[PDB]
Design a protein around this ligand. Structure first.
Ligand code: CHL
Ligand code: CLA
Ligand code: CLA
Ligand code: CLA
Ligand code: CLA
Ligand code: CLA
Ligand code: CLA
Ligand code: CLA
Ligand code: CLA
Ligand code: BCR
Ligand code: SF4
Lengths: 31, 215, 731, 80, 35, 99, 182
């Protein structure tokens, strides 16, 4: 039973959130 | 001053001199320059006015007894072929918005027709501009809503309101269509201003060099 | 102009060398301007958090792509007749035959057939559905976000730990052995017993019902009364079928050894027992060193006490605690050496003791995993030796390392280098001479004149394991012996069945070609170690350049004086040794791949009478197995192997593009660039634009690195393409 | 911007100064050698780094040591 | 494979849009002079 | 397989007793010679690691021989490991002998 | 008095905090800011465990369902909207609590910092707040681990233990575990 559209979209949104976390860490490392 | 979340720290350039300043610009689109920021304000005002017109038309059309607003494109039968309609619409709006560009490049603000200020009824003041801006913001959120129930559900805005009133605990944003995506967004957004407060507590507001657009 | 903000010396360079060295010196934090040791270690800690988040994102992406576009559901039901799917392909360059040729494992569109073995691993650890894989991907996404937040948090001055906290060695070892090693292994035992053991027997266990299912019918009471043997009552029978309750059992910690008859892999209860024993021993090991509780060890005093009398080791290990603790490069060299050796161990063990269900039937997966881990191990070992050379250049203090083993080994480094040179010279002479003699007698029509030295020592150790094929009847090959009788009710039956079967990779039968290629591998290891050890020991100085430590770890040369000083730094020795590492791992993986290609076809003879001479290596392995590879696309059409043919030619191109930087050097290119700068500065209609950075030729060290990078990339891509094409296209 | 240094093993043979193609080195009076002269590097900003001075130094080990460092438009020897 | 349109949007995004924007941004930043 | 209660209790009591009366002087001598883990000369605490400060619940004890709580727990843990080892190796009924 | 008759406190005494003994064998209050942050965290965890224990006891006295099985029950609104509405409301509330911690170092609720209506605040009363919090955190851990072994409520466990303390101890729950789980 393959995953649904909503699962993919929720995963992509959570990846956007962790991308925000990643750029926060990168900015902290640059400073 | 009220902000985009309770007790928020606004950005340095969002001091409060501009109307409708709740200090909300995490992506910082208009930080380095003021003229471009004035252009963003003008775009916000134009989109908000056209959204007030949109939501008024959709609410009145859905209330009188007509069909859905999105399906009303094929429910219009009259004269004038579609190509002639397109060409007269494009020439009329080209003239109107060229006049609008002249008005904005003169006054710094928009205007209908040759009238750059445009106020025959005389109701120009600092407070009523804020009323217009906030009503336009609300109507923009309302049209985003309206299009979203058109996409997700098969009911009109008043029909969707009646569906919510019938069963608010089982007919809402959190269902099975986009319910989980909305749930994740609510969970993330319920904690992220607390993370902003954490960043302010541990790092502070010392104006970082980088911005979410690469300047 | 101010792009390399970490290096103002580089920022003042008005050429393209500024940005070129800005990219390449970004992670050398010790060389950055205004860098203290506190800020150093804090940056290290935050970059570690970033790396952990990157790794967790990568495995979450693997999980999400298998759950979203893979055929895990279909592969679980039919593990031997379904090709695992890596991810879907969306390339708008595909023609229609390319779209058909890449639609394979029952998917809707073009997909890539996974060779990473994630399917077998996830099936073995009890993952059955795409929903479980998606849940794992989401959990790893959240945990990577948490690690990113921790990396941001510990850079904040309220949460920045002190430098002495970083150097607290006893506490860090105690928690790493007890918690990072021990508690993690105990939790993996818990997962295996609670989830993987029932899912191996057709009993679904999830977060919804693992609190209502009993891992063993006698729960906890045998554990707490000391009747631990009740957890090894009835093991899984030889007729047991994976993922079904047919002939299963109740034991959670069996101890039979060998392999599962159906999956040809290790028993999962054996793994649970192994992980529990490892967890116990590692928690005990993590209770060793002294922290704040008045008991434990001061490792400095242990190093102080390890001084033999009569001056055998000089001062012994005087001050090695501070030498290791103060030097990040010493610690990184030790860590890379151990991690590379462990990667080699992982490669050598998973092929011969397949751990995952329905592994060693997927021949492409085993070969790809082995070659991947071997190349990773070789690169990491070269990095270990390079960082040892850096520690000699940077962090080595002769005053505090006076008389200890480091000063002793630096004192007689000429003996070490000369004896490595002797061993490498002997191995090269003899292995090449035997191979060329075998080639010549093969060519002249006389195979009986070959020198075929029987590997009697390795066969003797194989017989000590219980391999009753050479007739030694030594230790475990004789049932009367004490080791054979000691565990005959324990691991001996399954291990002996595995060792005496020719259907697996548990110690393969070896011959003279194995002897010759083992000496080739010995030559490769010896020469690579010679180059790396010589570069480390001569890093501080030599007779040609006594003051080499002042010039740093990496520099071009010392000019054409004193006869010539090309490639004199320790960086250049690492650079030369990377080629030898690539050659050695190429020999190792060629040997592995040809041996297993003979095994999987059932024709061990092709290797047995073709590996003793090099024409057999070129013809019966390189030429023969590349036939399907180079026909991936042709004037008559294309098939699924076209991607590996393109990658084959791609790697050849990158290899020769590396040769470009390797052979030609900086001087022809500088003159050419000056001539082209003259051309552009006075070409009409192009003088409107000009370069912000002055175009210059790549520096000597930079272009050496670029040529080495292209060499390694072409090497790896070419061999990966050939191996995956010649195994997947054939099996 | 190359670091050029002179050390007391210099015998004042002036060969490093003659070997220099950009006039970085010169002889200053000294009392530590028989020739009563030692090399000096007042114009290291003109040093390209060719190490021709090192190729001319007869002292073992050499006394005029060049350390390649920061690169400028003159250290890189660019005419464009 | 659910949501077949999503690769068709994401692959050009990380192949054209994001790489062009990243390359332009880094080219601007390496010669920013006064950051 | 001969009563977990008696075996565990006896082994723990024995480990505590040989840790308090038998092995205490050599353990004290080793703890005195090794002492604090020191880095670059001084200890971890003197270099700034406030987490590496010797906990005050072990420094002073009313035990005449200075047998602290941490020593008690370490010796009890060793005794429990030995007791569970012998219980587990007596639970199994197989020929582990090399005969 | 301290938690060990014969030791001395490392960096604590009765002049500061509430419910202050010498109990920090790992030494986690070595940072003053971390000490006060952990004090606020201890108070918040104690308050949450206190409300939890009161609710669990009050639900089981009146009946209803078991506390560890009440989530699986069917309510007037689905678990999704319930989780989201709770997330919004107490994200707002916890943001107010954290912002109130940002200026003054005390706890509170909404705009009151401290949330102390009608008085009844004392240093001796603060020791009552923390120690009851310690008791309720220990009690909730007991509730949790007891429910993980024997599938019964805290009051039902107490009645079963008072029926037979010799056999219905925590040792007997390990013996009973193959019987209560199937
Ligand atoms: C804040 C702390 C918190 C804690 C410690 C727990 C703990 C628990 N919750 Mg729970 N919950 C918590 C908050 C919340 N829950 C829920 C909604 C649910 C649900 C819907 C369910 C639980 C269930 C459970 C239990 C899972 C055990 C199990 O696998 O049983 C075995 C599971 C089955 C036999 C089914 C467990 C004791 C489950 C339960 O009661 O299981 C009996 C369950 O179904 N919780 C919400 C609303 C969003 C919560 C907070 O807002
Ligand atoms: C504000 C700009 C705007 C927006 C957002 C829409 C949006 C929409 N239009 Mg519309 N349209 C517009 C301007 C716009 N239109 C203008 C200026 C004209 C005059 C040329 C039309 C004439 C038009 C027709 C004739 C139809 C739509 C239809 C539609 C709907 C489906 C479109 C489709 O996928 O098939 C197209 C959709 C919600 C279709 C519809 O009503 O759905 C049944 C349809 O029949 N539109
Ligand atoms: C019990 C407490 C504890 C725990 C759990 C950890 C855990 C960790 N620490 Mg930490 N640390 C601790 C205490 C602890 N530490 C203390 C007390 C101090 C102060 C003295 C520090 C100081 C410290 C520093 C300075 C750093 C860490 C770092 C790390 C991370 C190591 C990198 C990694 O994840 O690789 C994982 C390692 C393993 C999984 C071990 C596996 C063993 C081999 C290599 C593999 C073989 C296993 C098996 C065969 C593989 C099969 C898996 C396969 C199927 C996929 C890790 C998560 C580093 C870091 O990353 O920063 C965040 C680092 O910089 N720690
Ligand atoms: C850390 C890994 C881990 C975890 C989290 C669990 C968790 C669980 N196990 Mg399990 N188990 C494990 C490892 C683990 N186990 C191992 C290695 C084995 C031997 C192969 C078993 C064999 C086993 C059996 C036979 C049974 C369970 C059962 C259970 C469940 C009931 C709790 C219980 O046992 O009563 C409470 C336990 C205690 C009161 C004693 C714990 C105190 C120990 C001795 C000291 C604590 C130190 C330790 C290092 C702490 C680790 C912390 C870690 C969780 C982070 C529970 C969810 C029972 C069940 O009903 O399944 C649902 C059951 O019958 N387990
Ligand atoms: C835990 C692993 C680890 C860590 C933390 C370090 C850390 C460090 N290393 Mg080291 N190293 C390692 C492993 C490691 N290394 C290994 C395994 C090797 C063997 C390959 C080396 C060999 C090495 C050398 C020779 C040197 C360092 C240096 C350094 C220091 C500066 C890094 C730098 O130069 O900037 C950043 C580094 C880079 C940006 C790497 C450049 C990019 C590579 C070469 C190209 C990759 C292209 C890619 C594969 C193409 C894809 C193919 C596809 C398109 C087909 C730094 C402290 C340098 C130093 O100490 O300064 C004196 C030094 O010269 N390392
Ligand atoms: C196969 C390896 C290789 C390759 C690709 C090259 C390539 C090149 N060499 Mg070279 N060379 C090599 C080996 C190689 N060499 C070796 C081993 C040596 C040592 C003896 C030399 C010594 C040498 C000298 C002395 C000189 C060159 C010169 C040149 C350049 C000639 C200009 C040209 O050919 O036009 C076109 C470029 C190519 C054909 C290269 C491939 C480009 C492809 C086909 C098209 C580009 C599309 C691109 C991939 C799309 C971008 C994708 C994007 C994602 C990046 C050229 C780039 C000469 C020079 O400087 O220029 C005149 C020069 O004098 N080489
Ligand atoms: C590092 C792990 C990793 C890798 C190597 C890939 C690789 C790929 N993904 Mg994928 N992805 C990942 C993680 C990863 N993904 C995760 C965790 C998710 C869950 C949200 C997704 C969700 C996802 C979807 C929905 C799709 C892809 C697709 C693809 C393919 C085209 C790229 C694309 O257009 O989508 C863009 C990818 C994203 C928007 C999310 C990826 C974010 C990762 C974690 C960034 C990691 C960067 C790394 C740590 C550091 C590199 C430096 C970099 C920041 C410059 C490509 C082969 C497409 C496809 O299926 O092709 C057919 C597709 O539509 N991915
Ligand atoms: C890594 C991501 C990536 C992606 C997603 C693409 C995608 C594409 N490539 Mg490309 N390419 C890439 C990398 C990539 N390429 C690289 C690295 C190279 C160097 C090796 C090339 C070299 C290359 C060549 C030589 C060609 C393509 C072509 C194409 C297009 C295929 C034909 C088609 O669809 O009709 C047409 C495509 C479109 C209609 C979409 C583009 C324009 C749309 C409508 C937006 C325009 C906006 C504007 C305001 C109007 C397609 C859009 C072919 C092409 O069509 O040329 C453009 C072709 O000739 N590529
Ligand atoms: C905080 C750690 C801790 C402490 C202080 C104790 C303390 C004790 N344990 Mg215990 N135990 C622990 C952890 C601990 N245990 C853990 C983690 C496990 C799981 C492996 C066990 C499993 C365990 C068992 C199975 C038994 C004990 C028993 C005992 C008691 C025997 C002492 C005696 O003199 O017997 C009497 C001395 C003679 C008869 C001589 C004692 C009070 C034994 C007991 O119940 O006492 C009868 C016993 O049977 N423990
Ligand atoms: C450069 C340098 C460095 C590095 C080095 C290295 C890299 C090393 C190494 C090495 C290695 C890499 C090693 C390895 C090893 C291992 C070993 C040495 C082992 C052992 C043992 C034994 C003896 C065993 C036995 C056995 C067998 C045989 C099998 C079975 C089991 C038994 C046990 C029986 C440093 C930083 C430090 C310092 C500086 C310089
Ligand atoms: S060449 Fe050497 S010895 Fe002669 S003057 Fe120059 S530095 Fe002195």
């Amino acid at each position: 039973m393959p995953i649904a559209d909503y699962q993919v979209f929720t995963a992509l949104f959570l990846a956007l959130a962790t991308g925000i976390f990643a750029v926060r860490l990168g900015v902290a490392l640059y400073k | 001053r009220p902000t985009w979340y309770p007790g928020a720290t606004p950005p340095k350039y969002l001091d409060g001199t501009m109307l409708g300043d709740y200090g909300f610009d995490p992506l910082r689109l208009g930080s380095k320059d003021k003229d471009v920021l004035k252009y963003y304000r003008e775009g916000e005002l134009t989109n908000g006015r056209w959204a007030m017109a949109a939501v008024a038309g959709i609410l009145f059309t859905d209330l009188v007894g007509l069909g859905p607003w999105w399906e009303a494109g094929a429910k219009v039968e009259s004269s004038f072929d579609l190509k002639t309609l397109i060409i007269i619409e494009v020439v009329t709006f080209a003239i109107l918005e060229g006049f609008r560009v002249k008005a904005y490049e003169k006054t710094g603000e928009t205007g209908l027709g040759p009238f750059a200020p445009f106020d025959p009824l005389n109701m120009r003041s600092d407070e009523t501009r804020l009323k217009e801006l906030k009503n336009g913001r609300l109507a923009m959120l309302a049209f985003l809503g309206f299009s979203s129930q058109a996409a997700v559900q098969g009911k009109g805005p008043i029909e969707c309101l009646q569906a919510h009133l019938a069963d608010p605990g089982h007919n809402n944003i959190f269902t099975s269509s986009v319910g989980n995506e909305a749930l994740a967004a609510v969970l993330v957004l319920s904690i992220t201003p607390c993370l902003i407060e954490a960043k302010n507590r541990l790092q502070g507001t010392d104006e970082e060099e980088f911005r979410p657009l690469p300047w | 102009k101010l792009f390399p903000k970490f290096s103002q010396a580089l920022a003042q360079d008005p050429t393209t060398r500024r940005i070129w060295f800005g990219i390449a010196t970004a992670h050398d934090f010790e060389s950055h301007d205004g860098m203290t040791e506190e800020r150093l270690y804090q940056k290290i800690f935050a970059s570690h958090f970033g790396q952990l988040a990157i790794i967790f994102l990568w495995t979450s992406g693997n999980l999400f792509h298998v759950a979203w576009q893979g055929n895990f559901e279909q592969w679980v039901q039919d593990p031997l007749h379904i090709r695992p799917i890596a991810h879907a392909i969306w390339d708008p360059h595909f023609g229609q035959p390319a779209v058909e040729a890449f639609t394979r494992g029952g998917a809707s569109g073009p997909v890539n057939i996974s060779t990473s073995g994630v399917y077998q691993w996830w099936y073995t650890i009890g993952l059955r559905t795409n929903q479980e894989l998606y849940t794992g991907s989401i959990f790893l996404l959240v945990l990577a976000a948490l690690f990113l937040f921790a990396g941001w948090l510990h850079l904040q001055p309220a949460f920045q730990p002190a430098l002495s906290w970083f150097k607290n060695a006893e506490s860090r070892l105690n928690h790493h052995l007890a918690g990072l090693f021990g508690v993690s292994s105990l939790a993996w035992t818990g997962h295996l017993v609670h989830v993987a053991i029932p899912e191996s027997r057709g009993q679904h266990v999830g977060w919804d019902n693992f609190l209502t299912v009993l891992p063993h019918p006698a729960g906890l009471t045998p554990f707490f009364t000391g009747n631990w043997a009740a957890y090894a009552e009835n093991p899984d029978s030889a007729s047991h079928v994976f993922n079904t309750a047919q002939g299963s059992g109740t034991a959670i910690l069996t101890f039979l050894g060998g392999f599962h008859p159906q999956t040809q892999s290790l028993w999962l209860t054996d793994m649970a027992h192994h992980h529990l024993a490892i967890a116990v021993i590692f928690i005990l090991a993590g209770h060793m060193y002294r922290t704040i509780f008045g008991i434990g060890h001061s490792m400095r005093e242990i190093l102080e006490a390890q001084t033999p009398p009569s001056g055998s080791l000089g001062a012994g290990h005087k001050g090695l605690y501070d030498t290791v603790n103060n030097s990040l490069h010493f610690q990184l060299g030790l860590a890379l050496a151990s991690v590379g050796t462990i990667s080699s161990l992982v490669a050598q063990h998973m092929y011969s003791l397949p751990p995952y269900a329905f592994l060693a039937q997927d021949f492409t997966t085993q070969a790809a995993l082995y070659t991947h881990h071997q190349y990773i191990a070789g690169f990491i070992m070269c990095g270990a030796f390079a960082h040892g050379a850096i520690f000699f250049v940077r962090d080595y203090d002769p005053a505090q390392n006076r008389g200890n083993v480091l000063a002793r080994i630096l004192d007689h480094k000429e003996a070490l280098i000369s004896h490595l040179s002797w061993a490498s010279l002997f191995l090269g002479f003899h292995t090449l001479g035997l191979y060329v003699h075998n080639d010549v007698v093969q060519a002249f029509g006389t195979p009986e004149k070959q020198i075929l030295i029987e590997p009697v020592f390795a066969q003797w150790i194989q017989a000590a394991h219980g391999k009753t094929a050479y007739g030694f009847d030594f230790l475990l090959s004789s049932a009367t012996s004490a080791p054979s009788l000691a565990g005959q009710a324990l691991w001996l039956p399954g291990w002996l069945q595995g060792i005496n079967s020719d259907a697996n990779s548990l110690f393969l039968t070896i011959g003279p070609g194995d002897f010759l290629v083992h000496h080739a591998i010995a030559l490769g290891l010896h020469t690579t170690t010679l180059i790396l050890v010589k570069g480390a020991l001569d890093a501080r100085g030599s007779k040609l350049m006594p003051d080499k430590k002042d010039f740093g770890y990496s520099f071009p040369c010392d000019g054409p004086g004193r006869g010539g000083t090309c490639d004199i730094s320790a960086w250049d020795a690492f650079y030369l040794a990377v080629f030898w590492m690539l050659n050695t791992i190429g020999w190792v993986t060629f040997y592995w791949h040809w041996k297993h290609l003979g095994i999987w076809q059932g024709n061990v003879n092709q290797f047995n009478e073709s590996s003793t001479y090099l024409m057999g290596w070129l013809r019966d392995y390189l030429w023969l197995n590349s036939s399907q590879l180079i026909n991936g696309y042709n004037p008559f059409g294309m098939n699924s192997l076209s991607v590996w043919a393109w990658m084959f030619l791609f790697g050849h191109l990158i290899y020769a593009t590396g040769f470009m930087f390797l052979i030609s050097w900086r001087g022809y290119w500088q003159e050419l660039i000056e001539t082209l700068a003259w051309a552009h500065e006075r070409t009409p209609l192009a003088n409107l634009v000009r370069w912000r950075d002055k175009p210059v030729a790549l520096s000597i060290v930079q272009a050496r690195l670029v040529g080495l990078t292209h060499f390694s990339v072409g090497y790896v891509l070419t061999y990966a393409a050939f191996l995956i094409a010649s195994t997947s296209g054939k099996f | 911007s190359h670091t050029v240094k002179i050390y007391d093993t210099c015998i004042g043979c002036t060969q490093c100064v003659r070997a220099c193609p950009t006039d970085v080195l010169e002889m200053v009076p000294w009392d530590g050698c028989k020739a009563n002269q030692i090399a000096s590097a007042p114009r290291t900003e003109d040093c390209v780094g060719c190490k021709r001075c090192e190729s001319a130094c007869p002292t073992d080990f050499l006394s005029v040591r060049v350390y390649l460092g920061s690169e400028t438009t003159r250290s890189m020897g660019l005419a464009y | 494979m659910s949501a077949q349109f999503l690769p068709s949007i994401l692959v050009p995004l990380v192949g054209l849009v994001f790489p062009a924007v990243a390359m332009a941004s880094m080219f601007l930043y390496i010669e920013k002079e006064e950051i | 397989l001969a009563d977990v209660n008696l075996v565990v209790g006896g082994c723990t009591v024995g480990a505590l007793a040989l840790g308090r009366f038998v092995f205490l002087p050599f353990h004290r001598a080793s703890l005195a010679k090794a002492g604090m883990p020191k880095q670059n000369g001084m200890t971890h605490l003197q270099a700034g690691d406030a987490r590496a400060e010797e906990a005050s619940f072990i420094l002073k004890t009313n035990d005449p021989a200075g047998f602290t709580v941490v020593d008690v727990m370490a010796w009890g843990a060793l005794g429990h490991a030995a007791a569970f080892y012998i219980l587990a190796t007596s639970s199994l009924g197989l020929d582990r002998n090399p005969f | 008095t301290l938690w060990l008759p014969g030791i001395q406190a490392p960096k604590y005494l009765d002049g500061k905090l509430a419910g202050d003994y010498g109990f920090d064998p790992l030494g986690l209050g070595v940072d003053s800011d971390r000490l006060k942050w952990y004090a606020e965290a201890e108070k918040t965890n104690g308050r949450w465990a206190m409300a939890a224990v009161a609710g669990i006891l009050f639900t089981e006295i009146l009946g209803k369902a078991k506390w560890f099985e009440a989530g699986a029950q069917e309510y007037w609104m689905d678990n999704g909207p319930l989780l989201a509405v709770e997330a919004v409301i107490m994200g707002f509330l916890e943001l107010k609590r954290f912002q109130g911690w940002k200026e003054t170092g005390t706890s509170g609720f909404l705009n009151a910092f401290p949330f102390d209506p009608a008085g009844m605040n004392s240093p001796s009363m603060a020791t009552k707040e923390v120690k009851n919090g310690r008791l309720a955190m220990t009690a909730f851990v007991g509730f949790a681990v007891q429910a993980l072994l024997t599938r019964q409520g805290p009051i039902e466990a107490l009645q079963s233990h008072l029926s037979s303390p010799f056999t219905n101890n925590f040792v007997g729950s390990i013996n009973n575990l193959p019987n209560v789980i199937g």
